[PDB]
UniProtKB/Swiss-Prot annotation, chain A:
Residues 7-49 form a coiled coil. Changing S40A: In strain: Alpha/B.1.1.7. This is Spike protein S2'. It comes from Severe acute respiratory syndrome coronavirus 2. It comes from the Viruses. Subunit of the fusion protein that is processed upon entry into the host cell. Mediates fusion of the virion and cellular membranes by functioning as a class I viral fusion protein. Contains a viral fusion peptide that is unmasked after S2 cleavage. This cleavage can occur at the cell membrane by host TMPRSS2 or during endocytosis by host CSTL. In either case, this triggers an extensive and irreversible conformational change that leads to fusion of the viral envelope with the cellular cytoplasmic membrane, releasing viral genomic RNA into the host cell cytoplasm. The chain holds residues 943 to 991 of 1273 of the full protein.
Swiss-Prot record, chain B:
It comes from Severe acute respiratory syndrome coronavirus 2. Residues 6-8 are annotated as: Integrin-binding motif. The chain holds residues 398 to 446 of 1273 of the full protein. Binds to host ACE2. RBD also interacts with the N-linked glycan on 'Asn-90' of ACE2. Cleavage of S generates a polybasic C-terminal sequence on S1 that binds to host Neuropilin-1 (NRP1) and Neuropilin-2 (NRP2) receptors. Interacts with host integrin alpha-5/beta-1 (ITGA5:ITGB1) and with ACE2 in complex with integrin alpha-5/beta-1 (ITGA5:ITGB1). May interact via cytoplasmic c-terminus with M protein. May interact (via N-terminus) with host bilirubin and biliverdin, thereby preventing antibody binding to the SARS-CoV-2 spike NTD via an allosteric mechanism. Attaches the virion to the cell membrane by interacting with host receptor, initiating the infection. The major receptor is host ACE2. When S2/S2' has been cleaved, binding to the receptor triggers direct fusion at the cell membrane. When S2/S2' has not been cleaved, binding to the receptor results in internalization of the virus by endocytosis using host TFRC and GRM2 and leading to fusion of the virion membrane with the host endosomal membrane. Alternatively, may use NRP1/NRP2 and integrin as entry receptors. This is Spike protein S1. Changing G49S: In strain: Omicron/BA.1, Omicron/BA.2.75, Omicron/XBB.1.5, Omicron/EG.5.1. Changing D8N: In strain: Omicron/BA.2, Omicron/BA.2.12.1, Omicron/BA.2.75, Omicron/BA.4, Omicron/BA.5, Omicron/BQ.1.1, Omicron/XBB.1.5, Omicron/EG.5.1; complete loss of interaction with host integrins.
Swiss-Prot record, chain C:
Binds to host ACE2. RBD also interacts with the N-linked glycan on 'Asn-90' of ACE2. Cleavage of S generates a polybasic C-terminal sequence on S1 that binds to host Neuropilin-1 (NRP1) and Neuropilin-2 (NRP2) receptors. Interacts with host integrin alpha-5/beta-1 (ITGA5:ITGB1) and with ACE2 in complex with integrin alpha-5/beta-1 (ITGA5:ITGB1). May interact via cytoplasmic c-terminus with M protein. May interact (via N-terminus) with host bilirubin and biliverdin, thereby preventing antibody binding to the SARS-CoV-2 spike NTD via an allosteric mechanism. The lineage of its organism: Viruses, Riboviria, Orthornavirae, Pisuviricota, Pisoniviricetes. This is Spike protein S1. Changing S28F: In strain: Omicron/BA.1, Omicron/BA.2, Omicron/BA.2.12.1, Omicron/BA.2.75, Omicron/BA.4, Omicron/BA.5, Omicron/BQ.1.1, Omicron/XBB.1.5, Omicron/EG.5.1. Attaches the virion to the cell membrane by interacting with host receptor, initiating the infection. The major receptor is host ACE2. When S2/S2' has been cleaved, binding to the receptor triggers direct fusion at the cell membrane. When S2/S2' has not been cleaved, binding to the receptor results in internalization of the virus by endocytosis using host TFRC and GRM2 and leading to fusion of the virion membrane with the host endosomal membrane. Alternatively, may use NRP1/NRP2 and integrin as entry receptors.
Length: 49, 49, 50
């Protein structure tokens, strides 16, 4: 428990990268979170939107 | 660019359109800058027989 | 069918060809949602309901 200051620096940088990776699963209002769905389902005029 | 087509096919004269008129007769650029102007010509172009 | 009493067929266990559909001018409208009609021939589906 005494090294909590250094373990906190390891833990904060993991929370930051895990949040950044998990944000790839978000839609952001698109048809899918997976970019290959959009490109395999829609033609360019609708895909690019 | 000037030509005659049937009224149904006039919809194919726009960017990103597909079908035998767009794909095998007259194809626009996807990013075309221009105007598409059309008029019915049954009184000019149709004939008996 | 009547529109209040719409009739559903499950399509399954078969190969499609949607170009037979989307190339035909016979259809007074052909509107697709979540897919481009010209892209239908590349896909597969669990079932279709007509």
């Amino acid at each position: 428990s005494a090294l909590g200051k250094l373990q906190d620096v390891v833990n904060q940088n993991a929370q930051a990268l895990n949040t950044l990776v998990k944000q790839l699963s978000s839609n952001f209002g698109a048809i899918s979170s997976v970019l290959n769905d959009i490109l395999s389902r829609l033609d360019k005029v609708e895909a690019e939107v | 660019d000037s030509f005659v087509i049937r009224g149904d096919e006039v919809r194919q004269i726009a960017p990103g359109q597909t079908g035998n008129i767009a794909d095998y007769n007259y194809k626009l650029p996807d990013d075309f800058t221009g105007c598409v102007i059309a008029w019915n010509s049954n009184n000019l172009d149709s004939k008996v027989g | 069918a009547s529109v209040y009493a719409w009739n559903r067929k499950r399509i399954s266990n078969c190969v499609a060809d949607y170009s037979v559909l989307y190339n035909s001018a016979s259809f007074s409208t052909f509107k697709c949602y979540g897919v481009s009609p010209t892209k239908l021939n590349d896909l597969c589906f669990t079932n279709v309901y007509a």
